[PDB]
Amino acid sequence: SSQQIYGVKYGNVTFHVPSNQPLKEVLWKKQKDKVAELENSEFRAFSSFKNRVYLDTKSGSLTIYNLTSSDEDEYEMESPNITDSMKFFLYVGES
Amino acid sequence: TNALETWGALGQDINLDIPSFQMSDDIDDIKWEKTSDKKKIAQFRKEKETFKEKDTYELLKNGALKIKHLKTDDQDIYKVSIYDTKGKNVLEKIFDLKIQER
């Protein structure tokens, strides 16, 4: 279910989504709020996560750059070509 | 758990209204999801054309979802997710559509 992802300040992480089919519609969330989404093919990062991330247009995997400790939260992603949600938990490591 | 239990009558239409909601400009993604099956039926994105799975549904100003000629399947747990122009959650509410076979 939920995977614990450990990171490090100023560093960057990558949420690996075990996929196969190129889900061309996905939405990443940092709890109640959105992070990045894919609509009919029109990428869109929100707020702080602007320029700060990269979304794999095939395995719907997400990659955040430059961790800020304020990112240590609960992440979850959704998609129609689904099979019940994926919830990652980021732990912004120390250094 | 705050499932605002709603009562509908078989064959007739129904309106799922969002309480103290007010349509602004900060609004962007109004989403209406049908729990069980888990896939949006309606969605209002800023200015990108209102999406609707079946004409059975209709979006009404102020994110109101309309379910025409209720059916036996139309009985589910409906959720609404409204996001602003910043990817923030403006509000979240759940509806318990219980249709009575009067």
Number of domains chain A contains: 1
Strands A26-30 and A74-78: antiparallel
Contact yes or no for A47 and B92 at CB 8 A: no
Q: Which residues are CB-neighbours of B65 under 8 A, at least 6 positions away?
A: B15, B16, B32, B41, B42, B57, B58, B59, B78, B80
Residue of chain A minimizing CA distance to B85: A46
The CA distance from A12 to A64, in Å, is 6
Number of domains chain B contains: 1
Q: Report the residue from B39, B45, B87 with minimal CB separation from A47.
A: B87
Residues A49 and A93: beta-carbon distance below 8 Å: no
**B90 Rama sector, left if φ>0, alpha if ψ -120 to 50, beta otherwise:** alpha
Residue of chain A minimizing CA distance to B35: A84
Report CA-CA distances (Å) from A40 to A11, A27, A43, A82, B2. 31, 12, 9, 16, 33
Structure tokens at A23: 């889900």
Strands A62-64 and A53-55: antiparallel
Which domain, by its residues, includes B87?
1-102
For residue B82, the tally of other CB atoms under 10 A from its CB is 21
Query: Is residue B87 within 8 angstroms of chain A, CB to CB?
Result: yes
Q: Report the residue from A33, A80, A82 with minimal CB separation from B88.
A: A33
- Mapped onto helix, strand or coil, the DSSP state of residue B92 is strand
Query: Is residue A33 within 8 angstroms of chain B, CB to CB?
Result: yes
CA angle A73, A82, A75 (to 5 degrees): 5
CATH number at residue B51: 2.60.40.10
Contact yes or no for B88 and A47 at CB 8 A: yes
Structure tokens at A4: 């614990």
CATH number at residue A61: 2.60.40.10
The CA distance from A88 to A35, in Å, is 13
Q: Which residues are CB-neighbours of A48 under 8 A, at least 6 positions away?
A: A68, A70
Contact yes or no for A33 and B39 at CB 8 A: no
